Amino acid sequence: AYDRAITVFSPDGRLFQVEYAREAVKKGSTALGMKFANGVLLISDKKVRSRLIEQNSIEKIQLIDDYVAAVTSGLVADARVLVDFARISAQQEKVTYGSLVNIENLVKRVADQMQQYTQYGGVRPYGVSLIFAGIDQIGPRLFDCDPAGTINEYKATAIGSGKDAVVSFLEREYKENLPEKEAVTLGIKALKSSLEEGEELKAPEIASITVGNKYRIYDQEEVKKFL
Amino acid sequence: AYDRAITVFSPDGRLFQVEYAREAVKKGSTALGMKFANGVLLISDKKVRSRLIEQNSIEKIQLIDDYVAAVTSGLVADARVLVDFARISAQQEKVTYGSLVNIENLVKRVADQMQQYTQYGGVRPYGVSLIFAGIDQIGPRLFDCDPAGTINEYKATAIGSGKDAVVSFLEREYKENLPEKEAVTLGIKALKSSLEEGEELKAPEIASITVGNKYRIYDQEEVKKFL
Amino acid sequence: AYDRAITVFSPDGRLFQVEYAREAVKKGSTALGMKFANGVLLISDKKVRSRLIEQNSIEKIQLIDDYVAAVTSGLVADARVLVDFARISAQQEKVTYGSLVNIENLVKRVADQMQQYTQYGGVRPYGVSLIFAGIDQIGPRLFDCDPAGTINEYKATAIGSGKDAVVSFLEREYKENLPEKEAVTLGIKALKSSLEEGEELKAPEIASITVGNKYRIYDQEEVKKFL
Amino acid sequence: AYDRAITVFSPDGRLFQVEYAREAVKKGSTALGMKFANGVLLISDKKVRSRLIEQNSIEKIQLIDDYVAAVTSGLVADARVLVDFARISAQQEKVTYGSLVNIENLVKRVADQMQQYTQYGGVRPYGVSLIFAGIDQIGPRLFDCDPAGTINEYKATAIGSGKDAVVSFLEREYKENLPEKEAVTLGIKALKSSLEEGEELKAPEIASITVGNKYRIYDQEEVKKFL
Amino acid sequence: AYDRAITVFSPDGRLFQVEYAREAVKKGSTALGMKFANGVLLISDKKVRSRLIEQNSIEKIQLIDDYVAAVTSGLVADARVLVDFARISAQQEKVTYGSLVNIENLVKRVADQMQQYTQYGGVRPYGVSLIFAGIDQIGPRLFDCDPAGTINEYKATAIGSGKDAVVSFLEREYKENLPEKEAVTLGIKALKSSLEEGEELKAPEIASITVGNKYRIYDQEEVKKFL
Amino acid sequence: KRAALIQNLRDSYTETSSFAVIEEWAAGTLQEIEGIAKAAVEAHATIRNSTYGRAQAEKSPEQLLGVLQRYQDLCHNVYCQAETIRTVIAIRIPEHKEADNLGVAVQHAVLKVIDELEIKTLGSGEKSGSGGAPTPIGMYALREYLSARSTVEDKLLGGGSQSPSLLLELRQIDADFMLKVELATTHLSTMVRAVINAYLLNWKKLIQPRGGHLDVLYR
Amino acid sequence: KRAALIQNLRDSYTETSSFAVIEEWAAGTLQEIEGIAKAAVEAHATIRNSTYGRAQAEKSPEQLLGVLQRYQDLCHNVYCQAETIRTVIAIRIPEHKEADNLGVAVQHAVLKVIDELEIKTLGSGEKSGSGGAPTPIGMYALREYLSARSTVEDKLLGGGSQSPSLLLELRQIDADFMLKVELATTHLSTMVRAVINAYLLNWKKLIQPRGGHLDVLYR
Amino acid sequence: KRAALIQNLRDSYTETSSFAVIEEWAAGTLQEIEGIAKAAVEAHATIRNSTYGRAQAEKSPEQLLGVLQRYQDLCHNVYCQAETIRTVIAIRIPEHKEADNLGVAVQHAVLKVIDELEIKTLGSGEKSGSGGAPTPIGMYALREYLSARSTVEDKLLGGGSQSPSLLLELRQIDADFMLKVELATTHLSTMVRAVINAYLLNWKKLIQPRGGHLDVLYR
Amino acid sequence: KRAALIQNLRDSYTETSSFAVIEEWAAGTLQEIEGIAKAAVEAHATIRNSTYGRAQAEKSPEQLLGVLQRYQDLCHNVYCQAETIRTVIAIRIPEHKEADNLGVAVQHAVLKVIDELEIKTLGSGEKSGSGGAPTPIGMYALREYLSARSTVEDKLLGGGSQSPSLLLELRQIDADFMLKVELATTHLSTMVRAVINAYLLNWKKLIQPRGGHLDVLYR
- CA C16 vs CA C25, G8, G99, G209: distances in Å: 14, 32, 9, 16
Nearest in space to H122 (alpha carbons), one of H141, H146, H150:
H141
Which runs of consecutive H residues, i.e. helices, occur in I50-163?
62-90, 102-119, 141-157
Query: Could you tell me if residue D49 is left (phi over 0), alpha (psi between -120 and 50 degrees) or otherwise beta?
Result: beta
CA I194/CA I26 separation, integer angstroms:
10
Strands D61-62, A216-218: pairing kind: unpaired
Task: Encode chain B in three state secondary structure.
Answer: CCCCCCCCCCCCCCCHHHHHHHHHHCCCCCEEEEEECCEEEEEECCCCCCCCECHHHCCCEECCCCCEEEECCCEHHHHHHHHHHHHHHHHHHHHHCCCCCCCHHHHHHHHHHHHHCCCECCECCCCCCEEEEEECCCCEEEEEECCCCCEEEECEEEECCCHHHHHHHHCCCCCCCCCCHHHHHHHHHHHHCCCCCCCCCCCCEEEEECCCCCCEEECHHHHCCCC
Phi, psi values for residue G211, rounded to 5°:
-80, 150
Least CB-CB distance to D16: which of F97, F99, F216?
A: F99
Convert I159-206 into a string of H (helix), E (strand) and C (coil): CCCCCHHHHHHHHHHHHHHHHHHHHHHHHHHHHHHHHHHHHHHHHHHH
How far apart are alpha carbons H126 and H137 in whole angstroms?
A: 8
Do B16 and H99 make contact, defined as CB atoms within 8 angstroms?
yes
Q: Chain B interface, mutation test: which of A75, A76, A117, most B Cβ atoms within 10 Å?
A: A75
**Distance from first CA to last CA of chain E, Å, rounded?**
48
- Sorted by where each begins, the domain ranges of chain C are 1-227
User: What is the C-alpha to C-alpha distance for residues A113 and F10, in angstroms, rounded to an integer?
Assistant: 68
**Could you tell me which chains touch chain I, where touching means 3 or more CB pairs under 8 A?**
A, E, H
* Cβ–Cβ under 8 Å, residues E65 and E94: yes
* Chains A and F: 3 or more CB pairs within 8 Å of each other: no
Q: Which amino acid is at G38?
A: K
Query: What CA–CA distance (Å, rounded) separates D130 from D79?
Result: 9
Residue of H nearest to G132 (CA): H131
Write out chain A residues lying below 8 Å of H217, CB-based. Answer: 75-77
C-alpha span between C123 and C113 (Å, rounded): 12
Helix and strand numbers, DSSP H then E, in chain H: 7, 0
Nearest CA-CA partner of H29 in H71, H74, H93: H74
Strand-pair partners of E71: E61, E131
User: Domain for residue H214, yes or no?
Assistant: no
Chain I residues with beta carbon closer than 8 angstroms to that of H8: 26
Q: How far is CA C129 from the centre of its chain?
A: 6
- DSSP code string of F46-95: HHHS----GGGGTS--HHHHHHHHHHHHHHHHHHHHHHHHHHHHHTT---
Q: Residue A198: in which H helix or E strand, if any?
A: none
Q: Is the dihedral of CA F68, F71, F75, F81 positive or negative?
A: positive
Which of C121, C148, C153 lies at the smallest CB-CB distance from B77? C148
Best of H197, H202, H205, H206 to mutate (most G CBs within 10 Å, chain G) = H197
User: Does chain C reach chain G with at least 3 CB pairs under 8 Å?
Assistant: yes
Mutate which of A2, A4, A7, A9 to test chain E, going by most E C-beta atoms within 10 A?
A9
Q: Which of D213, D172, D165, D173 is nearest to D191 (CA)?
A: D165
Which of B1, B9, B149 is opposite residue A81, by nearest beta carbon? B149
Whether F contacts G, i.e. 3 or more CB pairs less than 8 A apart, is yes
CA distance H160 to A102: 112
**Which CATH number characterizes residue H3's domain?**
1.20.120.180
Which residues does H66 contact at the CB level (< 8 Å), separation at least 6? Answer: none
What span, in angstroms and rounded, lies between the C-alpha atoms of E195 and F15? 82
User: CA-to-CA distance for E43 and E207, rounded, in angstroms?
Assistant: 7
Q: What number of helices (H) and strands (E) belong to chain A?
A: 6, 10
**Euclidean distance between CA atoms E124 and E121, whole angstroms:** 8
Are residues D190 and D34 in contact, defined by beta-carbon separation less than 8 angstroms?
no
**Nearest one of C69, E20, E7, B201 to A15, comparing CA atoms:** E20
Amino acid in position B143? F
Q: E123 and A122: CB-CB below 8 Å?
A: no
Q: What residues have CB less than 8 Å from A172, skipping those under 6 apart? A: none
Do G212 and G110 form a contact (C-beta atoms < 8 A)?
no
The answer to whether chain A touches chain C by having 3 or more C-beta pairs less than 8 angstroms apart is no
Q: Name beta bridge partners: E208.
A: E41, E216
CA distance D51 to D54: 8
Chains F and C touch (3+ CB pairs under 8 A): yes
- Residue pair E210/E38 in contact by the 8 Å Cβ criterion: yes
3-state helix, strand, coil in chain F (%, to 5): 75, 0, 25
Tell me, yes or no, whether H217 lies in a domain.
Answer: no
In Å, the largest CA–CA distance within chain H is 90
Cβ–Cβ gap H96/I105 under 8 Å: yes
Do the chains contact at C3 and D15, CB–CB below 8 Å? no
Query: Do residue A12 and residue I97 have CB atoms under 8 angstroms apart?
Result: yes
Question: CA B112, B117, B118, B124: dihedral to nearest 10 degrees?
Answer: -150
Chain A residues within an 8 Å CB radius of H219: 28-29, 60, 73-74, 76, 79
The DSSP line for C34-92 is EEETTEEEEEE------TTB-GGG--SEE-SSSSEEEE--SBHHHHHHHHHHHHHHHHH
Say whether C81 and D112 touch across the interface (CB within 8 A): yes
A17 touches chain H (CB under 8 A): no
Query: How does C144-177 read in b/e, with b if 16+ C-beta sit within 10 Å?
Result: bbbbbbbbbbbbbbbbbbbbebbbebbbeebeee
Compute the distance between CA of residue F197 and CA of residue F201 in angstroms, rounded to an integer: 6
Residue of I44, I37, I45, I42 whose CA lies nearest to I70: I37
- The helix/strand/coil state of H199 is helix
Which are the contacts of F160, defined by CB distance < 8 A and separation ≥ 6? Answer: F54
Tell me whether I217 touches chain E (CB under 8 Å). yes
Q: Which residues of A touch H214 (CB under 8 A)?
A: 27
**For chain H, how big is the Rg over CA atoms in Å?**
23
The answer, for G214 touching chain B at a CB cutoff of 8 Å, is yes
According to CATH, what is the number of the domain E1-227? 3.60.20.10
- Residue I196 located in a structural domain: yes
Helices vs. strands in chain C: H and E counts, helices first? 6, 10
Helical (H) or strand (E) element with D205: strand D205-209
Quick check: is H86 in a domain?
A: yes
Closest listed residue to residue B212, CA positions, set B137, B103, B102, B105 = B137
CB D167 within 8 A of CB D136: no
Q: How would you classify residue A142: left for phi > 0, otherwise alpha for psi between -120 and 50, otherwise beta?
A: beta
Distance CA A50, CA A119 (A): 39
CB-side exposure of G85: number of CA atoms within 13 Å? 31
* Spatial CA neighbour of D68 closest among D97, D115, D33, D116: D33
Report the C-alpha gap between I142 and I156 in whole angstroms. 21
- Selecting from G97, G99, G218 the residue whose C-beta is nearest the C-beta of C16 gives G99
CB-closest option in C7, C121, C153 to B56: C153
Whole-number Cα distances in Å, F55 to A156, A183, F144, I169: 109, 116, 21, 47
Residues in B closer than 8 angstroms to H216, CB to CB, are 150
Q: Which of B20, B57, B113 to mutate to test binding with chain C, by most C CBs within 10 Å of its CB?
A: B20
Cβ of residue B48 closer than 8 Å to a chain G Cβ: no
3-state secondary structure of A70: strand
Q: Which residues pair with C142 in a beta bridge?
A: C133
- Residues of chain F in contact with residue C127, where contact means CB-CB under 8 angstroms, are 218
Annotated resolution, angstroms: 4.0
Instruction: Report the C-alpha gap between F168 and F178 in whole angstroms.
Output: 16
Give the span between the Cα atoms of H187 and H137, in whole angstroms.
11
Strand partners, B24: none
Cβ–Cβ < 8 Å for D147, D160: no
Q: F111: Cβ–Cβ under 8 A, 6 or more apart, which residues?
A: F86, F89, F90
For every residue of G168-215, DSSP letters joined together read HHHHHHHHHHHHHHHHHHHHHHHHHHHHHHHHHHHHHHHH-S----GG
Q: Alpha-carbon distance B30 to C159, whole Å?
A: 29
In angstroms, the Cα distances linking C209 to C75, C153, C158, C212, D94 are: 27, 17, 18, 8, 36
Question: What number of H helices and E strands is found in chain F?
Answer: 7, 0
**Strands E68-71 vs E130-135: parallel, antiparallel or unpaired:** antiparallel
Beta strands E140-145 and D205-209, pairing class = unpaired
Buried b (16+ CB within 10 A) or exposed e, E2-18: ebeebeeeeeeeebbbb
Instruction: Please name the member of A14, A122, A149 whose beta carbon is closest to the beta carbon of E24.
Output: A14
Do the chains contact at H146 and I23, CB–CB below 8 Å?
no
A 10 A CB-CB count for G136 gives: 24
DSSP C157: E
Q: Number of B to C CB contacts under 8 A, please give it.
A: 89
Q: Measure the CA–CA gap between B52 and B67, rounded to whole angstroms.
A: 31
Are B29 and B46 contacting, i.e. CB atoms less than 8 angstroms apart?
Answer: yes
- Smallest Cβ–Cβ distance between B152 and the set A27, A57, A78 belongs to A57
* CA D136 to chain centroid: 18
Number of domains comprising chain I: 1
With an 8 Å Cβ cutoff, the interface of chain D facing chain C consists of: 2, 6-15, 18, 34, 111-112, 115, 118-122, 148-157, 167, 170-171, 174
I98 touches chain A (CB under 8 A): yes
Q: Please state the separation of Cα I157 from the chain's center in Å.
A: 35
Residue F213, in any domain of the structure = no
Q: Is the dihedral of CA E184, E186, E191, E197 positive or negative?
A: positive
For an interface test with H, the pick among A3, A25, A27, A130 (most H C-beta atoms closer than 10 Å) comes out as A27
Range of the domain at F167: 1-208
Largest CA distance in chain C: 54
Sheet holding C216-218, edge to edge: C156-159, C31-36, C39-44, C205-209, C216-218
**H or E segment at F152?**
helix F141-157
F214 to chain C: closest CA residue: C27
Q: Does I212 touch chain A (CB under 8 A)?
A: no
Task: Give how far Cα B86 sits from Cα of B69, C117, I94, Å.
Answer: 9, 21, 54
* Secondary structure class of A140 (helix, strand, coil): strand
Find the angle CA(B107)-CA(B113)-CA(B114) to the nearest 5 degrees: 90
3-class DSSP assignment, residue D117: coil
Within 13 Å, how many C-alpha atoms sit on residue C47's CB side?
10
Question: Which method was it determined by?
Answer: X-ray
**F194, G187, H142 from F115: Cα distances, Å:** 13, 12, 38
Judge whether E28 is closer than 8 Å to chain I, CB to CB: yes
Residue in I with minimal Cα distance to E21: I218
DSSP string, chain E: --TT-TT---TTS--HHHHHHHHHHTTS--EEEEEETTEEEEEE------TTB-GGG--SEE-SSSSEEEE--SBHHHHHHHHHHHHHHHHHHHHHSSS---SHHHHHHHHHHHHHTTT-TTB------EEEEEE-SS-EEEEEE-TTS-EEE-SEEEESSSHHHHHHHHTTT--TT--THHHHHHHHHHHHTTS-TT------EEEEE-TTS--EEEPHHHHTT--
Q: Torsions phi, psi of B137, nearest 5?
A: -45, -25
Does some domain include residue F217?
Answer: no
In a domain, H116, yes or no: yes
Are the Cβ atoms of E76 and I215 closer than 8 angstroms?
no
I117 CB contacts (<8 Å, ≥6 apart)?
Answer: I78, I82, I188, I191, I192, I195
Which of B174, B144, B149, B143 has its CA nearest to residue B159?
B144
Distance from CA of G100 to the nearest CA of C (A): 8
* Selection from I171, B206, G123 nearest residue H143 by Cα: I171
Closest residue in B to C18 (Cα–Cα): B77
**Pairwise CA distance, residues E225 & E208, whole Å:** 16
- B→C contacts (Cβ < 8 Å), by residue, are 3-6, 17, 20-27, 50-54, 56-58, 75-77, 80-81, 117, 121-124, 127
HSE-CB at A19 with a 13 A cutoff on CA atoms is 22
